[PDB]
Amino acid sequence: GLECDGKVNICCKKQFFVSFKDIGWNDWIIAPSGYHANYCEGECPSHIALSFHSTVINHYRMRGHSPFANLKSCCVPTKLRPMSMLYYDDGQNIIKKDIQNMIVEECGCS
Amino acid sequence: GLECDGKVNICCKKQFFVSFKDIGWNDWIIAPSGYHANYCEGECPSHIAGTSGSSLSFHSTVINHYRMRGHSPFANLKSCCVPTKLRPMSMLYYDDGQNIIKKDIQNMIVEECGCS
Amino acid sequence: GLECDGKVNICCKKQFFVSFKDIGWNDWIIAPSGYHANYCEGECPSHIAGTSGSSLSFHSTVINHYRMRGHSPFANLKSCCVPTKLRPMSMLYYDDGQNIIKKDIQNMIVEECGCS
Amino acid sequence: GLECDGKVNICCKKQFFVSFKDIGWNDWIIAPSGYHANYCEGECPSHIALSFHSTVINHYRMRGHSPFANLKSCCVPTKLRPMSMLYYDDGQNIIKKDIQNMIVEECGCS
Numbered sequence: 001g002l003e004c005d006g007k008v009n010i011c012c013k014k015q016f017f018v019s020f021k022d023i024g025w026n027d028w029i030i031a032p033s034g035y036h037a038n039y040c041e042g043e044c045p046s047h048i049a050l051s052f053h054s055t056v057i058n059h060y061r062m063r064g065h066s067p068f069a070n071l072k073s074c075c076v077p078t079k080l081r082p083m084s085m086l087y088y089d090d091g092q093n094i095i096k097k098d099i100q101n102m103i104v105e106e107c108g109c110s
Numbered sequence: 111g112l113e114c115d116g117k118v119n120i121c122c123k124k125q126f127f128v129s130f131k132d133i134g135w136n137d138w139i140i141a142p143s144g145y146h147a148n149y150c151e152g153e154c155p156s157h158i159a160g161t162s163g164s165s166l167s168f169h170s171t172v173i174n175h176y177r178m179r180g181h182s183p184f185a186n187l188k189s190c191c192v193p194t195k196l197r198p199m200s201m202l203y204y205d206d207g208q209n210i211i212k213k214d215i216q217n218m219i220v221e222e223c224g225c226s
Numbered sequence: 227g228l229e230c231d232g233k234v235n236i237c238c239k240k241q242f243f244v245s246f247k248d249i250g251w252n253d254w255i256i257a258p259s260g261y262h263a264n265y266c267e268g269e270c271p272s273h274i275a276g277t278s279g280s281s282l283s284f285h286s287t288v289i290n291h292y293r294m295r296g297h298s299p300f301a302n303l304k305s306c307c308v309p310t311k312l313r314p315m316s317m318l319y320y321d322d323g324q325n326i327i328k329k330d331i332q333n334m335i336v337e338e339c340g341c342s
Numbered sequence: 343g344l345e346c347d348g349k350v351n352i353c354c355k356k357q358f359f360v361s362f363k364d365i366g367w368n369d370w371i372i373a374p375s376g377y378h379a380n381y382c383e384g385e386c387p388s389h390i391a392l393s394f395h396s397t398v399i400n401h402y403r404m405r406g407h408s409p410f411a412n413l414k415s416c417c418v419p420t421k422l423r424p425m426s427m428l429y430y431d432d433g434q435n436i437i438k439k440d441i442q443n444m445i446v447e448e449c450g451c452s
């Protein structure tokens with residue numbers, strides 16, 4: 001997908017870093033101190049809309065056949081990566097775990 | 111995730127039968143000729159923004175932090191009912207390399223919907 | 227090949243100004259924003275079937291053998307005014323690998339037309 | 343591109359061999375004795391139409407904007423290969439030459 005700069009208008013990935021200290025989560029997250037979560041922003045006009053399932057919806061959208069005639073496309077993550085994390089749990093044990101769905105790696109039009 | 115039913119107004123999964131005839135792709139796809147793909151639709155109000163049915167991922171949890179507290183752009187950003195899990199499907203078709211392939215094509219069937 | 231002019235009815239090359247705005251592709255193409263692509267049109271009667279203006283390739287010469295003598299399928303096969311030579315063009319655009327590329331894109335400008 | 347079998351209906355490459363003996367050209371073509379010239383046959387409907395120049399024409403065709411609204415697409419060679427050939431010339435000298443545009447290697451919709 002596209003990486004947002006300040007020029008591209010269409011759906012892209014915006015770099016976004018989050019400190020656990022700044023948001024007050026470091027009391028239970030020991031490590032890492034922060035990471036690039038990222039997010040998706042941007043337009044999804046007709047001339048673009050894994051896209052495989054979305055593409056077939058888009059092909060149906062190309063005729064006024066009416067579930068998809070109205071269905072607006074959205075810029076959303078199309079790929080997420082996990083990340084290793086150390087944290088306190090309910091019994092306050094320190095746990096090490098590969099946490100799924102932590103980083104947005106790519107964005108796309110639904 | 112949620113499946114649509116009577117009176118469900120929020121993001122849910124419903125049937126979508128794809129016939130390749132209908133979009134002309136039967137000129138190169140041999141099998142299957144049609145399949146249940148499914149689709150996601152419905153409202154994503156803020157009390158379910160980022161969720162995947164009854165689950166909330168870590169990433170959605172940090173976005174909610176900012177959204178909840180009014181920080182931009184996340185305050186303006188629309189939440190859309192979209193697939194969160196897809197399954198592949200075995201397919202037999204003609205490709206551009208001048209031959210007929212059988213292969214598992216990724217992300218062809220919607221398994222779960224949720225709010226971006 | 228032939229260029230169109232007054233009273234030319236057969237296959238010839240004419241102007242076609244492409245503006246990327248018009249087809250939405252300016253959302254990822256930075257430069258050029260528009261260009262003279264050209265196009266081929268007009269009649270391909272049998273006395274010029276297979277030719278490229280004033281030239282006739284070897285391949286077209288064997289097809290004409292069969293066409294001329296009525297052999298099928300070549301007897302039924304339509305002859306179309308189509309490009310026979312194209313030129314590339316330098317382009318600056320955003321690709322899917324999350325970056326901005328400069329590169330010579332092939333077969334963007336029609337140089338010569340002729341009959342299939 | 344696609345290779346015609348008897349099943350695909352859309353624009354494909356049809357294998358076609360031509361003997362110079364059968365067609366009476368062996369008096370001036372010494373070698374080779376024959377070759378696969380091939381040809382293109384098949385439909386080109388909307389859902390398909392280097393395609394780069396053709397694609398942009400197709401993108402214009404997707405609105406009734408009117409040069410291309412009517413312009414029917416045709417199955418034609420998109421790639422030709424040369425082949426080495428021995429032949430008698432006007433002075434009846436034997437010439438060896440890489441003859442361009444002898445084999446149709448791929449077909450496509452204009």
Ligand SMILES: CCC[C@]1(C)C(=O)Nc2ccccc2C(=O)N1CC
Pocket residue numbers: 052053055056135138139201203215
């Ligand atoms: C959306 C299915 C995508 C797939 C797998 C493919 O590899 N390329 C394309 C690309 C565009 C349109 C259809 C196909 C297509 O028919 N096939 C074969 C099933």
Ligand SMILES: CCC[C@]1(C)C(=O)Nc2ccccc2C(=O)N1CC
Pocket residue numbers: 251254255317319331394395397398
């Ligand atoms: C028809 C120009 C083809 C090219 C070179 C490309 O590599 N892929 C696509 C594919 C589909 C549509 C446009 C482009 C596209 O915009 N680009 C960048 C100029």
